[PDB]
Design a protein around this ligand. Structure first.
Ligand SMILES: Nc1nc2c(ncn2[C@@H]2O[C@H](COP(=O)(O)OP(=O)(O)OP(=O)(O)O)[C@@H](O)[C@H]2O)c(=O)[nH]1
Ligand SMILES: Nc1nc2c(ncn2[C@@H]2O[C@H](COP(=O)(O)OP(=O)(O)OP(=O)(O)O)[C@@H](O)[C@H]2O)c(=O)[nH]1
Ligand SMILES: Nc1nc2c(ncn2[C@@H]2O[C@H](COP(=O)(O)OP(=O)(O)O)[C@@H](O)[C@H]2O)c(=O)[nH]1
Ligand SMILES: Nc1nc2c(ncn2[C@@H]2O[C@H](COP(=O)(O)OP(=O)(O)O)[C@@H](O)[C@H]2O)c(=O)[nH]1
Lengths: 429, 106, 426, 429, 426
């Protein structure tokens, strides 16, 4: 029934604090834990007054988890559930996965085994990491790694924030992301992806603001995510379990990575304008300028979409708005796939931050999907890697951290067959 | 008249030199020219003390007399100098001396 | 994490006073006082440079190595001079002769053990050690010789912890000594083979950058030092602060050194505007990259424009958009594709702290690993040969128990070091 | 049912703000969008309490569209629908059509494809441009151009303000107007024409005022236009659809240009005088001093008139007032045309600005028509062109803007057969 | 849109002070203050001439080029002198000799790079650049030579953005210099081939127009300058205001230049009535065209009545009837069909702003492209030959590294320029 969550890496933690915020916000549970089953699949009714979170936090520098235990919400989690390794983060996979990251893992696991026990027939762990980091790429790599073995019998949906197409940060980023992909690939169930840059566009083009603090992108994913777990694990006219996803969403064992998209992104101050039609939002979903991912459907044929709706929506409206789409053709779906549209309908409309910059409509569409499109995104990220590896660039930083020419070269070959995979499962009939 | 020359600094392959005029009325000798060249080519990367000698375009021989300076010439500034030799300068047009080229009716 | 500064020689020492003059204020630590910190964040990470004893006395964890009393007795008899625990002062009342050989083989070699002793007392302080900061000048005894030894020993004791080296490579135009290339070539040698991050500063690259980028007409040493110390604060200490994207010595190291030599960088500060007037505030950000990436403004002597880069690390520290930061860096990488080396798709290593330099709104330390620094070791190496050839003031070395093959060694080594660096400029 | 509108060029925008004003004014919708189907063919009920316009605004200098988003009405349109190209206007066709104007077009279209979708079975786009301008001549040229292909299946009635016969402004004007005619000719359905100068006469002779601000001429067309769309798309005793026009108004594919005329133009302050008879206004329509066009029926035989009446009018009154006319002969109608009188009767009388200078009668006649008369107006405007082209005058201004000796010479030949066309379809039996 | 003024030489500079003295008030910008603007419209378009840094300090985006310190040190030490960011002052403490050759080939050629540097810092300011305003006198060194170079470089750097040139062509009756035709002929040459809009003003056409059209008995320079600056404000800045029918540099350019030479105009202001009395207010409009189109009142020396027009641009700026404007222009075009050239059906380019000159009710700048200006370059060209023939003060040019073929060149060029212009008068 439930779904634990492990927010790994400063980022996965910032995004975590965010997604975690939106939560209580739409569940009437002040930062003090108290509100005045349903949603029990994400919150445990500990003591007789509060609602201790149902997740954990893993960063190797204290800085970021520290800030959580300062700002209201400080009261929300258990002093315990926020894991730290005073040591060093290191923007390098190796160190975070092998060398350092190792020391903590046990302890980390312990919670996802201590928190996994306390519950009642769970469904999986929503993992939150930032592909191109040290604690986010490496560590998790083995966290998800140690999970796929300790609970192979569950769902492993990892929600990632993969490398901005041109606006990356770390100098090595690819090293860290070609490595978190190959090690997690054979361990995840469904990997959701939200592109940091391609989200900015949305903040520039669909909300207008050249002042987007990280704290915003987080509010956004913090939204799209709320549409995944939160509301879905919440009763409705067309419920969709976590398993449901991976089933209706992955055509093949590769921990396939769909893309997250939201429909109503419109800025407060617009807040009064006449609302958008069920048809418009539906249509907005097929626009490559509103998908939290720089993977513009440049050719990538969709192969399965899970249209999660929430708010006031008439099933016919959908079983029509989608019909219209199924026949737009310029939206070309894979061949071997007749119908690939999982319509998920929830009741409770979205819930926008009291005064951030999100419109606040009475219905939204968080559609996610597997698109032969990422054939690109992976490509462009793989190429990166080579260029540097081709010169070993910052290689001495990993080797000296318990890695080898193996893990790199052999994780490169890995993704290679991910460029062929995402190519074969499509483009051909 | 004077003599138009394009003065390059040895070991630069970037700066297109500076054009100077040279005569008996402006500079009594090469030391006086070199004195003004130290001010106009004043640097601390290609030229140690700014400009102490002037070498041919190839750096095979240094000039000591103004009589060796021809119109529309190319010279190099040195102070050791050790020569790379840096040519460079190229490329520029000979239009500093005069525009050889003209417009055409295209 | 932690680090333990090292004030080798007078210069390295004089600068200590300025590096600590600053850093302290950038951490609210009065002479012997405690943390007056205007904020509460300038304390959660101090450890990196201090130690807890009393409760108001966080003492700088550095070492003061020098064979000339008067010096440390000027640093210890002035302003912040009374914050270092006396145990820190590893003096050598001997004759601090200006000979690399006199402070590396004969005179310094003795005072060494009484140093390592402390460098261990400080290392085994507590928590986890990161590396050691080293200040000195490669143009003297207690600096190049004895300090270059201090490291050769440090790097045998903890080949794990890092070693940043702040060297005052012999300025071109006019040298503040005569054998300079002797004391230098000999110390660079030791550097290229022990420390793994060196930040070379030039007393005259500073003057310039301090007399034209700061209309400052009377740039006393204190100043130069002050400017330098400004950069070394942005580097270390800084990153030991929070940030949207923070790094730390290693990141800096593991993103900046493509090849094991150790390679030397060239630090550059961001807001470098004259006091009153200039206070243009044109610091939105394009203004900082405008700054940092220009020729002048590179504490080094050489000019970047004279050779590609291998790596760059804009360690910014002041609230800004990971977009207007990550973005700018790009155009910069494309407007100058010419010099920025290609076999590294993204040379630049964007780093981003949060809290800025106490009184400023936005700054950004620059740590460049350009191939341009080839044209400096060349310089040095030249000066050597031109004088080695005649064994100029060599008797002051040999007569101190040295070798005619020792000088040969260094030059070559450091001379080859020039070679290699070109292997990438091409 | 509806009819979008694209006001192009500062002028087309000033006139736009005007025609757009008169609208709400006679529909009880304050500048705030709110009023306390019918007219839905020009206004979309965004929800909701508002009445977002049903058009767009295209100028390459901000100045003029800017002023709209200052003065009440600021609230009327959507912040979006007012397109601008901060760049440069340039009083030259070429630049506006080719070079610069190009960059914006896509975006422009997007709205007339985004606004064209939202509706329900539309009828066309009432385009508003100023023949002799840069953004007005050029741009549109390709806007209407890109429309005739994207919606060939609709109406393209472009409402133009063609070059004052002697009081032109731009030095080049003809270059810009011989070019907007040839490029739009093969794309429009019916091009309405209102002569800027010949309207002044009306302000001098039929209203008395030597103080006519542009803001007035605009109130006028702003009137004649209201008689076209507004009221017509509005129920009545003899409705006339947009298609109706082009059908009953163009005898031949040339995007034929009828002329706009209004009947009751009498100044407030006259406002009390006994009103004019159904016969008088009817007759006023056959006077060459009241037609918003310096094309005095110097010989031009009418070939089709669409007498749009509004207010209290008895069909017999018309089917008599017109009969009397049909037999005045000095009003000679074409040969091949027995009867060319489309009687359009609306109910609601006109609606004059609260306190401008328009009388305010209880019935009016906005008669428009195709008259062999323009044989002149085109002639006189073509000749202009030659004189300058004959010396290339400001030619270097276009060439250097992606044009050629072709487009000019080949657009001259174009109109040439427009001087023969408007000659052949008449003057002969 | 935007522009970046350029104060070449002393004159061009002296005038800068007046052009900015005005313009500012026509934009509510006090010395260093901000926008006190009586209205709110004098701000939405300022950008065209300023930059945002502080929030009360919108600094004029112009350049001050001059080889004579004292000058800029008089403009910077007086009234509005303290608004320009010092970076703007590109001085040349050299000997600002009165030689075109001394400020174009020998002395100015050096100071150029340090100018272009800034002209780029200002161009790459923000938004989109339109063109640059250029003030100077064609009768001196820093003016004709160095300023005429500044453009030849500008027009190589952005052959896209426009180039208006405000030249103080050598007044007839008396020359305020001696070589005048030398410094002149040489600069006009550069003009006819780089800038694409030139507004020629004559210190004595002004006096006249200032001593008889303004009973003004003591017309100091400040005045002349002031009058001129009045016109250049009506031109640019003005059109960057709203209007029933607005234009902008290009319109002005693309409606006024039939043939690529660049052609020079002759500006004329509208309400030019003496203070007290005259304040007749006869400004309904026929009064403005009455004004503008008369002989006297043309800042040029020559009289329109002495040669047809090719184009005219009445850039009015004050609420009026597009009818009484568009109309008047006509009769004017018919009462004088004689001189107005025919192969252009509508020579006149009516332009109409809204807001007028701060304190006035209705004005209208006149920019005439008449063939009359033939009879001026003639003048200049004559003076040359009469003195060139004897190589008068030629040694001051050649001795500065010039050519005997250089002078030949210019004269001819500019001399041919006279020729052509007649090709239309006929
Ligand atoms: N959406 C979003 N992206 C973030 C956020 N914080 C960081 N990122 C992105 O995630 C990556 C940064 O990872 P880091 O913060 O360097 O590292 P980490 O993954 O936390 O782990 P370490 O390297 O060991 O510190 C970059 O691509 C950032 O653009 C955040 O709050 N929201
Ligand atoms: N009736 C009417 N005519 C106008 C109005 N504004 C301008 N005009 C006329 O339209 C023509 C002017 O076009 P411009 O304003 O120069 O240019 P534009 O068409 O807006 O486009 P650009 O040249 O690029 O600025 C002239 O013939 C004017 O007489 C207006 O508000 N009403
Ligand atoms: N920036 C800087 N350089 C210094 C200072 N003191 C000496 N130097 C430089 O150091 C070199 C001389 O070495 P020195 O420090 O006297 O050697 P030591 O004292 O024998 O170890 C010269 O190049 C000086 O410019 C200082 O306080 N700041
Ligand atoms: N209108 C006007 N003319 C000026 C001013 N100053 C000098 N002039 C004219 O400029 C010419 C002299 O050139 P000058 O400006 O001294 O040259 P420069 O200073 O060496 O570049 C003479 O024809 C003067 O009448 C001025 O402030 N206003």
């Amino acid at each position: 029934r439930e779904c634990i969550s492990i927010h790994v890496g400063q980022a996965g933690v910032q995004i975590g604090n965010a997604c975690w915020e939106l939560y209580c916000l739409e569940h009437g549970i002040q930062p003090d834990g108290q509100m005045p089953d349903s949603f029990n699949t994400f919150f445990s009714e500990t003591g007789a007054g509060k609602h201790v979170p149902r997740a954990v936090f893993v960063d190797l520098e204290p800085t970021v988890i520290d800030e959580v235990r300062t700002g209201t919400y400080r009261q929300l989690f258990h002093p315990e559930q926020l894991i730290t390794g005073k040591e060093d983060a290191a923007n390098n996979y190796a160190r975070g996965h092998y060398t350092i990251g190792k020391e903590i893992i046990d302890l980390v696991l312990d919670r996802i085994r201590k928190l996994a026990d306390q519950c009642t027939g769970l469904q999986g762990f929503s993992v939150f990491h930032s592909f191109g980091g040290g604690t986010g790429s490496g560590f998790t790599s083995l966290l998800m790694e140690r999970l796929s073995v300790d609970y192979g019998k569950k769902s492993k949906l990892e929600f990632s924030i993969y490398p901005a197409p041109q606006v990356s940060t770390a100098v090595v980023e690819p090293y860290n992301s070609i490595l978190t992909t190959h090690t997690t690939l054979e361990h995840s169930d469904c990997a959701f992806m939200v592109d940091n840059e391609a989200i900015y566009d949305i903040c520039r083009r669909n909300l207008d603001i050249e002042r987007p603090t990280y704290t915003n992108l987080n509010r956004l994913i913090g939204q799209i995510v709320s549409s995944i777990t939160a509301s879905l694990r919440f009763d409705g006219a067309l419920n969709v379990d976590l398993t449901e996803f991976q089933t209706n969403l992955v055509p093949y064992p590769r921990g396939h990575f769909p893309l997250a998209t939201y429909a109503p992104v419109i800025s407060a101050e617009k807040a009064y304008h006449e609302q958008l039609s069920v048809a418009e939002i539906t249509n907005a979903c097929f626009e490559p300028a509103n998908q939290m991912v720089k993977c513009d459907p440049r050719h990538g044929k969709y192969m399965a979409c899970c249209l999660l709706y929430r708010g006031d929506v008439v099933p016919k409206d959908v079983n029509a708005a989608i019909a219209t789409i199924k026949t737009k053709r310029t939206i070309q779906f894979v061949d071997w796939c007749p119908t690939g549209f999982k319509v998920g309908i929830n009741y409770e409309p979205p819930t926008v931050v009291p005064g951030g910059d999100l419109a606040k409509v009475q219905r939204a569409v968080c559609m996610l999907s597997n698109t032969t499109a990422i054939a690109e995104a992976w490509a462009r990220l793989d190429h990166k890697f080579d260029l540097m590896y081709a010169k070993r660039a910052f290689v001495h930083w990993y080797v000296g951290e318990g890695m080898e020419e193996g893990e790199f070269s052999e994780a490169r070959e890995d993704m290679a067959a991910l460029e062929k995979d995402y190519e074969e499962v499509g483009v051909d009939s | 008249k004077a003599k138009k020359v394009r003065f390059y600094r040895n070991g630069d392959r970037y700066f297109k030199g500076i054009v100077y005029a040279v005569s008996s009325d402006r500079f009594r000798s090469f030391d006086a020219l070199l004195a003004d060249l130290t001010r106009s080519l004043s640097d601390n990367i290609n030229l140690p003390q700014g400009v102490r000698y002037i070498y041919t375009i190839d750096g095979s021989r240094k000039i000591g007399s103004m009589d060796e300076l021809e119109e529309g010439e190319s010279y190099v500034c040195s102070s050791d100098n050790f020569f790379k030799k840096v040519e460079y300068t190229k490329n520029v047009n000979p239009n500093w001396s005069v525009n050889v080229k003209t417009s055409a009716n295209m | 994490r932690e680090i333990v500064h090292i004030q080798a020689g007078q210069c390295g020492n004089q600068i200590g006073a300025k590096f600590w003059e600053v850093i302290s204020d950038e951490h609210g630590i009065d002479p012997t006082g405690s943390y007056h910190g205007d904020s509460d964040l300038q304390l959660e990470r101090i450890n990196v440079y201090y130690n807890e004893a009393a409760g108001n006395k966080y003492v700088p964890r550095a070492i003061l190595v020098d064979l000339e009393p008067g010096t440390m007795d000027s640093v210890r008899s002035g302003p912040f001079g009374q914050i270092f625990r006396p145990d820190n002062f590893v003096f050598g009342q001997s004759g601090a002769g200006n000979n690399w050989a006199k402070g590396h083989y004969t005179e310094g070699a003795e005072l060494v053990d009484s140093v390592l002793d402390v460098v261990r007392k400080e290392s085994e302080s507590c928590d986890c050690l990161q590396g050691f900061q080293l200040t000195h000048s490669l143009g003297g005894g207690t600096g190049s010789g004895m300090g270059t030894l201090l490291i050769s020993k440090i790097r045998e004791e903890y080949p794990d912890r890092i070693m940043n080296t702040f060297s005052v490579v012999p300025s071109p135009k006019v040298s503040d000594t005569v054998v300079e290339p002797y004391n230098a070539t000999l110390s660079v040698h030791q550097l290229v083979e022990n420390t793994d991050e060196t930040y070379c500063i030039d007393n005259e690259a500073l003057y310039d950058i301090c007399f034209r980028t700061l209309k400052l007409t009377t740039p006393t040493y204190g100043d130069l030092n002050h400017l330098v110390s400004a950069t070394m604060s942005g580097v270390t200490t800084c990153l030991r602060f929070p940030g949207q994207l923070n790094a730390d010595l290693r990141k800096l190291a593991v993103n900046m050194v493509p090849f094991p030599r150790l390679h030397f960088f060239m630090p550059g500060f961001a807001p470098l505007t004259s006091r009153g007037s200039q206070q243009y505030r044109a610091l939105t950000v394009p203004e900082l990259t405008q700054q940092m990436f220009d020729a002048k403004n590179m504490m080094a002597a050489c000019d970047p424009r004279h050779g590609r880069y291998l790596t760059v690390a804009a360690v910014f520290r002041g609230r800004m958009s990971m977009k207007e930061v990550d973005e700018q860096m790009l155009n910069v990488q494309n407007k100058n594709s010419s010099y920025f080396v290609e076999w590294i798709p993204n040379n630049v290593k964007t780093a981003v702290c949060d809290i800025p330099p106490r009184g400023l709104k936005m700054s950004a330390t620059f740590i460049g690993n350009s191939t341009a620094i080839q044209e400096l070791f060349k310089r040095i190496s030249e000066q050597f040969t031109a004088m080695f050839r005649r064994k100029a003031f060599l008797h002051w070395y040999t007569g101190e128990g040295m070798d005619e093959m020792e000088f040969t060694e260094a030059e070559s080594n450091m001379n080859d070091l020039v070679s290699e660096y070109q292997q990438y400029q091409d």
